[PDB]
Scaffold this active site. Structure first.
Site, short mmCIF file in Angstrom:
data_model
loop_
_atom_site.label_atom_id
_atom_site.label_comp_id
_atom_site.label_asym_id
_atom_site.label_seq_id
_atom_site.Cartn_x
_atom_site.Cartn_y
_atom_site.Cartn_z
N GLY A 13 1.40 6.16 9.79
CA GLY A 13 2.81 6.10 9.48
C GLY A 13 3.53 4.90 10.07
N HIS A 35 0.84 -1.23 0.00
CA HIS A 35 0.00 0.00 0.00
C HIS A 35 0.86 1.26 0.00
CE1 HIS A 35 -0.05 -0.77 4.44
NE2 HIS A 35 0.35 0.47 4.40
N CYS A 57 3.00 1.83 9.66
CA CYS A 57 3.03 0.53 8.97
C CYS A 57 4.39 0.19 8.47
CB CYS A 57 2.14 0.38 7.78
SG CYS A 57 0.46 0.65 8.37
N1 LIG Z 1 -2.08 6.90 1.62
S1 LIG Z 1 -2.21 5.49 2.60
O1 LIG Z 1 -1.96 4.14 1.64
O2 LIG Z 1 -3.70 5.43 3.24
C1 LIG Z 1 -0.94 5.59 3.95
C2 LIG Z 1 -0.14 6.77 4.00
C3 LIG Z 1 0.84 6.91 4.99
C4 LIG Z 1 1.04 5.87 5.95
C5 LIG Z 1 0.23 4.68 5.90
C6 LIG Z 1 -0.74 4.52 4.94
C7 LIG Z 1 -1.53 3.29 4.92
O3 LIG Z 1 -2.52 3.11 3.94
C8 LIG Z 1 -1.30 2.26 5.93
N2 LIG Z 1 -2.08 0.99 5.96
C9 LIG Z 1 -3.49 0.86 5.63
C10 LIG Z 1 -3.92 -0.34 4.98
C11 LIG Z 1 -5.26 -0.53 4.65
C12 LIG Z 1 -6.22 0.47 4.96
C13 LIG Z 1 -5.81 1.66 5.60
C14 LIG Z 1 -4.45 1.85 5.94
N3 LIG Z 1 -4.09 3.09 6.60
C15 LIG Z 1 -4.17 3.14 8.09
C16 LIG Z 1 -3.58 4.42 8.67
N4 LIG Z 1 -4.16 5.61 8.10
C17 LIG Z 1 -4.09 5.62 6.68
C18 LIG Z 1 -4.69 4.37 6.06
C19 LIG Z 1 -0.30 2.44 6.90
C20 LIG Z 1 0.47 3.62 6.92
O4 LIG Z 1 1.44 3.80 7.88
#
Ligand SMILES: NS(=O)(=O)c1cccc2c1C(=O)C(Nc1ccccc1N1CCNCC1)=CC2=O
Length: 305
Positions: free
Chosen positions: A143, A41, A145
């Protein structure tokens, strides 16, 4: 003496935490040899997370779109490929701090240490357990992840967990280091339900053995019980059914302690049916299930790395 929820020393893992940037999404990645592993992601915006086609989105991405940095030193991405729900970025240089490591998929009930990071730099470390429904109760802000969970045995760092998402319930889900989700989850921002969670029975019994070791013995009962009788009681209180394998893995504790395993289950039945009555066991007013028998033996043996 004393008993504590203890995390593994996190240095060897600190040495492989990099920051991975793609477009405007930034998260954490694990730099082992000349490969950086990260959640796929990373190639998404939040406008893509509602129903992303990861193949189609990755196809308009090239190596120059990914920016990997270790602290301040930078990595030249020279290849990329998607394995299940992780991205593997082949970089120009090999991590000089790569420890001896393995990728293993842990089973429910077993524990590991999570190193929580943001922008590729660590912020904390804590011990947690893989719930029977394949979730964990960690602490993961945005952030976070790409933060990893691991066990350390002597030389070897066995990575087992990479954090992916927060369920609407507030618990956390992730994959192994091959991109396969623990449980039935998809990397998608939609309502996803974890199953009924249950308590790791053998872990509670190991924690009670640790309590006996450390002086707290009030729960020690005079009944014993059949394995089937204890299972009858355990299924009512949503405990995982005890098997003979569990009894065997509790053998060392039952031998150092002198308390037969089935009597410990009798005391646990009494605790499940009568509560804790306002007292505590090793400083907790609830039955702790996030210590495996091996964790208890580690803390009593002082096993080192
Ligand atoms: N642009 S982004 O791709 O949303 C994104 C942008 C910055 C950091 C992260 C993400 C993530 O998704 C993400 N994993 C995730 C997987 C499935 C559904 C939602 C998320 N996240 C959860 C946290 N809030 C944003 C959405 C981890 C991050 O650390």
């Amino acid at each position: 003496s004393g008993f504590r929820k203890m995390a593994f020393p996190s240095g060897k893992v600190e040495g492989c935490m990099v920051q991975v940037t793609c477009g405007t999404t930034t998260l954490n990645g694990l730099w082992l040899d000349d490969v950086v592993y990260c959640p796929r992601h990373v190639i998404c915006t939040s406008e893509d997370m509602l129903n992303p086609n990861y193949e189609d989105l990755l196809i308009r991405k090239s190596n120059h779109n990914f920016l990997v940095q270790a602290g301040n030193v930078q990595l030249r991405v020279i290849g990329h490929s998607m394995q299940n729900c992780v991205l593997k970025l082949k970089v120009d240089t090999a991590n000089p701090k790569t420890p001896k490591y393995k990728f293993v998929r842990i089973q429910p009930g077993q524990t590991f240490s999570v190193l929580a990071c943001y922008n590729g730099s660590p912020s904390g470390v804590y011990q947690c357990a893989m719930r029977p429904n394949f979730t964990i109760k960690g602490s993961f802000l945005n952030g976070s992840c790409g933060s990893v969970g691991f066990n350390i045995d002597y030389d070897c760092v066995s990575f087992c967990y990479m954090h992916h998402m927060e369920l609407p319930t507030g618990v956390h889900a992730g994959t192994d280091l091959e991109g396969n989700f623990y449980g039935p989850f998809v990397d998608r921002q939609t309502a996803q339900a974890a199953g009924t969670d249950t308590t790791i029975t053998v872990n509670v019994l190991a924690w009670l053995y640790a309590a006996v070791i450390n002086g707290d013995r009030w729960f020690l009962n005079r009944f014993t019980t059949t394995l089937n009788d204890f299972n009858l009681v355990a299924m009512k209180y949503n405990y995982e059914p005890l098997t003979q394998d569990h009894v065997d893995i509790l053998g060392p504790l039952s031998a150092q302690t002198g308390i037969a395993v089935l009597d410990m289950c009798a005391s646990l039945k009494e605790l499940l049916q009568n509560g804790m009555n306002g007292r505590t066991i090793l400083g907790s007013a609830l039955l702790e299930d996030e210590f495996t028998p091996f964790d208890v033996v580690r803390q009593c043996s002082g096993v080192t790395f």
